[PDB]
Amino acid sequence: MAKIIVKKSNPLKGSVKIDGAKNAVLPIIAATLLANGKSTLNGVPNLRDVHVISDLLRHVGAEVEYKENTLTVDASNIKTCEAPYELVRKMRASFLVMGPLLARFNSTKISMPGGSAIGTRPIDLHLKGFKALGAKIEMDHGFVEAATEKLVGNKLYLDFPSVGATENIMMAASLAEGTTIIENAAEEPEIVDLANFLNEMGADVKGAGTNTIKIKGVKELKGAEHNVIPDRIEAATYMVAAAMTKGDITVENVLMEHLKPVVAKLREAGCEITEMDNSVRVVGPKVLKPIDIKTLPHPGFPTDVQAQFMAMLTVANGTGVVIETVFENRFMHVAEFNRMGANIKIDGRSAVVNGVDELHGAAVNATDLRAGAALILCGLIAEGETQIGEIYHIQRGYVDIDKKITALGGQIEIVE
Amino acid sequence: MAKIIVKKSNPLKGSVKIDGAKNAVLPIIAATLLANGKSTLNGVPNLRDVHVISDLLRHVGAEVEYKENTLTVDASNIKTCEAPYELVRKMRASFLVMGPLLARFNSTKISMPGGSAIGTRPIDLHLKGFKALGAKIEMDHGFVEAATEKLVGNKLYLDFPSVGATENIMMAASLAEGTTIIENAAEEPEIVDLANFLNEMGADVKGAGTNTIKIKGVKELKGAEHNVIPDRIEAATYMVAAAMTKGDITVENVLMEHLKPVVAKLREAGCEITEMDNSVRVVGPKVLKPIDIKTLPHPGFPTDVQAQFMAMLTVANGTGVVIETVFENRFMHVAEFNRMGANIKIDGRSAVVNGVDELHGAAVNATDLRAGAALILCGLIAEGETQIGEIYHIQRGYVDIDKKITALGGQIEIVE
Amino acid sequence: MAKIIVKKSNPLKGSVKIDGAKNAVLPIIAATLLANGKSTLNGVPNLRDVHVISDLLRHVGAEVEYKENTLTVDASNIKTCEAPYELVRKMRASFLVMGPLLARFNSTKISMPGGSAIGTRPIDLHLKGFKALGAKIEMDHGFVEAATEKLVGNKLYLDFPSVGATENIMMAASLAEGTTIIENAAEEPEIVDLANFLNEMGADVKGAGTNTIKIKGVKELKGAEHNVIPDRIEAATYMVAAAMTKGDITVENVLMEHLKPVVAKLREAGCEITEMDNSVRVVGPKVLKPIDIKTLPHPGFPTDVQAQFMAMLTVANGTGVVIETVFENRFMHVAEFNRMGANIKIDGRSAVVNGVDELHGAAVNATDLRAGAALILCGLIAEGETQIGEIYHIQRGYVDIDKKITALGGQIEIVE
Amino acid sequence: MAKIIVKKSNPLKGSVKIDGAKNAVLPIIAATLLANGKSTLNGVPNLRDVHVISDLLRHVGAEVEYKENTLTVDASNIKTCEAPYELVRKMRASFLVMGPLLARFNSTKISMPGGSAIGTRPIDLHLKGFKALGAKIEMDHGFVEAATEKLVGNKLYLDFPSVGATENIMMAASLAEGTTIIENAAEEPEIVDLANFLNEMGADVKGAGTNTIKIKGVKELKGAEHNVIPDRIEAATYMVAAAMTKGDITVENVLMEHLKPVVAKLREAGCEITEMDNSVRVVGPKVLKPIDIKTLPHPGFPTDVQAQFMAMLTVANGTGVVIETVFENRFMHVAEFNRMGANIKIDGRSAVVNGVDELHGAAVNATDLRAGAALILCGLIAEGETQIGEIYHIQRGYVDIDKKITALGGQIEIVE
């Protein structure tokens, strides 16, 4: 089956346009279900996970049309409030329809996400929020059912500033009676994009991007046009590629505000970075300085760039430490980096990376979306040729990574 | 040497006035050193750590006067910029004079804090910030020296949202040339109090209490009058005491905004809590419901109430899990709780508490400030009599815990 | 693709014959490569991993014949000393030919194992041992090459009592010049079986099953007949099944010595166990008592029975804690147990299991060999019907689990 | 109060005689209580912990005489079976009288050890063993009481190969009716010494030093003469000192068998070591090679030499990783090493040591016995002068460390 073949490449040089954020668009597509009427989402990346959640909206009865980076949804006449096992198994962000459906129909039944490549990932905080709003929860043969006679706003506290739980609870609260306060909310940029979209539909959401979000429920929402924010993780991926290849890359169609920790850590590693209004230029250092990273809730260093920064550290001039506080098992890529000649040792949530002279091409498997992209970065600097398998992991969340890297001068090819 | 003797007590009932926040006043006292002139701090708790940092200010040449909860400082004619080993060894918040002194005199030499009861606690992020402002750092025989020809504002990123580093860097940046941005800042309420005080002295600090703080340096600051915020951890301590003793306590002179996670978790445990403008009433449940807590940066659950909530969980109706993400070794109290008949097992950063019928009085030692207070809470509900040793831990950060608990109907006595 | 369908079942009752140990036979098959001549292995389980390593022996030029639980190997005329990427990727115990090949031909090149379902699993200790014997090591594009002018016995210390490293080093040392001492050796029963087989071929291996193994190299080894020990993990799997289903099962063709920790922990959980010469009877309790387990090197509790004991604990009468010290990510099954209604929370290497009334059938995926078998145990007691996917994990290491459970009265079927 | 002053020293050269093992003698002194009659222990180190447990034996009514490294005990006419809070608080090995007293009198009451400098250290496995022998356990106000109508031999499984629990259970089982089997026993050399002493008194203990110990109870034991084994941790401490100071030291009166992992790791670090019958010569390398250590049950690397090897690694030529699997909080020394200019970062149970050019003298505090000795090793190589406080930690478990290091050419002094 399919492989990505990467060869030792030239320093990457030129411009790359960044697509719309996967992780903004998935909850915003779920949010269209809140509205009686038609929404228009612009800047939608052409990704498999977008098509899967589109098919979930079709399954519950919304009218969905995608073309040329615009997705329309008419949720006027939703029929059903069940998310079947196969769709949640394919893509766990499916779970984000639970909030909207519960809010629109007072009842929903959603397959409970199972194992994940990057860890045991419970959805307890989502359900905590729904119960605080007056939903009763029960489990039936792998499904979780939530039903109420009406949602009522309430104060609720998130034990962890969960991105997903913040999204699900915000959407449910938008149509509740009264005022909801989400304490210890996720501050991620995608949370702000979602809130903006809810407000464009007629909601009253304040505080998004802060530690506390206040939602005053409205009786009804209407379809609206929204421009999705740019993919900050894709941007970061190309910024790291510039660092690792000692290249010079302008990343176009980005928001600097959303890239703060990545910019800071790349500068600490030796990069020369120029921040502009809609773009950032990254020039890689001649010698990579070892740095440490610790993944944390935004605006701490993002776990979605952890594997990619680890890959950069494998040829840094010294010892770097990576600490993963957000996910349990997000080190499955380490053994693959080691096949390419890295010197990485893990214990618990920390990985000690001892920089080597260079990596050497080898047959490797992507273990997950961000680690696969990290193996592509390894393959750009590794001597010889790298063959990456299980490439569906990559293809589900990066638009045309082969074409974008090809246009920056790298040697990469998807073969079937 | 001295002991606190606690006996099985009546349910606590009545009102308790909360003192000024230890952890607000210590950085605000350090901040008085920034000003050429005299500051007046009202609501200063009469605590040993206040007197230690006062003596540190005396050592560098400030004029300090304390009386009846007001502290005045005239920092007009500071002489010296060295913090000696004995003062930092006695109280590690001593380290918070480094920022002000560096800013006022362009040079400072500060003993580097050593071991701590609750963990290995580096000060690397403080120094990261100072270097970003143009300070050169070097180590000399246990001291860290930082010197510059002038501080210049800069963007800097905190790998962890460190309370202390946020404080130290904010104070240094207040007199720097140009604009400093602290990304991934601590959002703790004490950070806001400090910023307010800097602004009262003439500074330009915006964003405090958010994830990003922007400081535009000014050439000079002037002494100002400030009212310190109330001690949110002391308040929480009494709120827990109400829960554990099945009492009914009004905590006076508090800010509900600062107590959000404690209020939420006590309500989840079964308490009936009434939030008012300057006070909160806590009525304890008849049966404590087991809850889980996870310590996190504000507004996540505070590590300073972790031991005290653990103590509550030792008689809860089931199994609770405590996860300490902020400090490394903040479980030294567990063996002492176990001497009183708790059923607690730890591995790594998690403690599994299996609720028991009741605790039984025993001879125990406080291991640190918040754990000692937790042993007092255990002793209020434990059968018989509890004798607590190493009480200096407690006395350094609680005002008259014997008198306040005595006025709420508990049986407690300090003996010499 | 294929599924195992398990339904709520009767208590299991009757006898089950245990097959030969997967984990004894794989290193013993690698060890046949040491001998110039023909070996005969009896009690070989008819498992996919046996056929994969057989094909690896074919690839290097040994003559291999399997029939009716006997495998013969003639290693007289080995041709090549390379283990290709596809065979090691399929089955990482492939790596165990490195020791024999290095010893027979003074040179070997072996693909370095990559990611594993249950953790990042380096092979550094294997290479440490080979270097101590005089091998030079280098990496070439995912392969590790080891070559010497002659192996010479030496003292070497294992940082961890690695099963695989102990096996690989013992086999290499059997043909070395002089005496090797392996300090901090694995004491697992499979290590003793291997040593016995080496001695049957003419080796001089003493201390196997103790913390120190002394090998005096011989110039040549000869094929021998060996009876492989019974599969202690398969036995344990059926013993757990008896406990969980409240059944009464005699496990036939086992060695009690190898089952000590499993027998002790099942008795602590409430089982009535009768140890006999070649068999053990397990009668399950009416109420399962919660127990804690901590995985450790033999004779500590085996990590290969961890998932299966976790599954038992999901319906125990209280709270049990599972601590995995041997493998990093061996909790991927937890999310699947949770889909079936378990109440499991993990942090770091510990899992807190809060016993529930009963499990409920659901669609689940095996994540690995021992966890898949654990999902079958869940499905026997879960209400309704459980559908298990990714069943190749199970089928690679259990002989006819459907037929054996069917003969004990359970309802299970493999469908294609 | 008292300090140890160490100055940058010459390479250590000469011979040092090692004393009797603290950790052998403490359980062997407890074991004298088993015998009706008089025991004579030779090679008893003149240590405070020896005098504390001697006073515990006096408290229960044994006749104890110490002189010139011989301790006699007549346990003929024991009166009482209670270990008071003050003696256990002073020295937690006090707990090891519980087994003997329970066995001699069928009843005992022992204060339950509280907090410890190096971790939360439960005694649950001790009690598990006693209950398996027919003892009923209950807690009374910090004491644990264990009583039976008679101890009866039984099989019991240790979840962890606890040194203390193995000792306590072995001593209790020596006078039980029938045969006890301890599965997953501690294999530490001190366990063998104890068993030898029990057998010298008339017991029947086999398997000590293996993973399984079988005790056939006898009705009565008689006082015997015993020669205690040498202190393997003291020996290791001086061996490390040779490595760190680039010296050349013969350690006299040792058993090489007990030092295997320390010898292996020092050789991996670059030392030239010569093993002899009663002694070992260690010559330190010119450049220390970084190594990793992982603490484990014997014969894995001992946790009691972890701090001392960490100290060696602070000036090694590269990055070493220390992993502590045995104790929870055994990193309290790290902040003190950092005051002396080390570069150590911890997360969870792992410490990353990044070797520096040299350490620099500073005021430091011992946190515990083995860490204090490690600070002395730091002070021998640190530039200038090191002042170590809280020296009682050191003095309780090292005989005349000042005099022994002075005789090897180091500059050290205890001042009062």
Ligand SMILES: C=C(O[C@H]1[C@H](O)[C@@H](CO)O[C@H](OP(=O)(O)OP(=O)(O)OC[C@H]2O[C@@H](n3ccc(=O)[nH]c3=O)[C@H](O)[C@@H]2O)[C@@H]1NC(C)=O)C(=O)O
């Ligand atoms: C890996 C992905 O990207 C992830 C990204 O890594 C994380 C962190 O920034 O935030 C999103 O996941 P998420 O919403 O599942 O993440 P969070 O809920 O913040 O999870 C972080 C931590 O919270 C825990 N968590 C989350 C929810 C909950 O109810 N309980 C809970 O314990 C998780 O198990 C984890 O330990 C992204 N996904 C989307 C669709 O936005 C992906 O799903 O493809």
Ligand SMILES: C=C(O[C@H]1[C@H](O)[C@@H](CO)O[C@H](OP(=O)(O)OP(=O)(O)OC[C@H]2O[C@@H](n3ccc(=O)[nH]c3=O)[C@H](O)[C@@H]2O)[C@@H]1NC(C)=O)C(=O)O
């Ligand atoms: C225990 C105390 O209270 C503490 C309270 O527990 C914590 C957390 O809320 O915030 C203050 O400490 P702090 O400023 O030292 O805490 P933080 O800097 O946030 O430390 C949290 C975490 O960050 C780490 N940290 C901090 C600074 C740094 O340069 N590097 C670093 O790794 C710490 O080791 C720890 O793992 C309080 N002290 C004062 C005077 O405000 C006490 O010092 O008495």
Ligand SMILES: C=C(O[C@H]1[C@H](O)[C@@H](CO)O[C@H](OP(=O)(O)OP(=O)(O)OC[C@H]2O[C@@H](n3ccc(=O)[nH]c3=O)[C@H](O)[C@@H]2O)[C@@H]1NC(C)=O)C(=O)O
């Ligand atoms: C899961 C399997 O069964 C496993 C079983 O779980 C373990 C533990 O009992 O022992 C065998 O693996 P193994 O030989 O790879 O296991 P070990 O080497 O003991 O690994 C235990 C620990 O040591 C570590 N380890 C091992 C070798 C090494 O060079 N370095 C290292 O750090 C591992 O990563 C792990 O953390 C079994 N496999 C066979 C074929 O005997 C399987 O491979 O199917």
Ligand SMILES: C=C(O[C@H]1[C@H](O)[C@@H](CO)O[C@H](OP(=O)(O)OP(=O)(O)OC[C@H]2O[C@@H](n3ccc(=O)[nH]c3=O)[C@H](O)[C@@H]2O)[C@@H]1NC(C)=O)C(=O)O
């Ligand atoms: C630090 C000391 O030396 C120690 C030495 O570090 C350790 C490890 O080698 O073995 C002796 O302690 P010990 O008998 O208390 O140690 P162990 O019982 O093996 O403890 C190791 C691990 O097992 C745990 N443990 C032990 C007993 C128990 O019932 N439950 C339990 O969980 C401990 O908490 C720890 O995590 C030494 N003490 C003596 C008097 O022999 C000291 O007490 O001064």
Ligand code: NA
């Ligand atoms: Na844990």
Ligand code: NA
């Ligand atoms: Na770690």
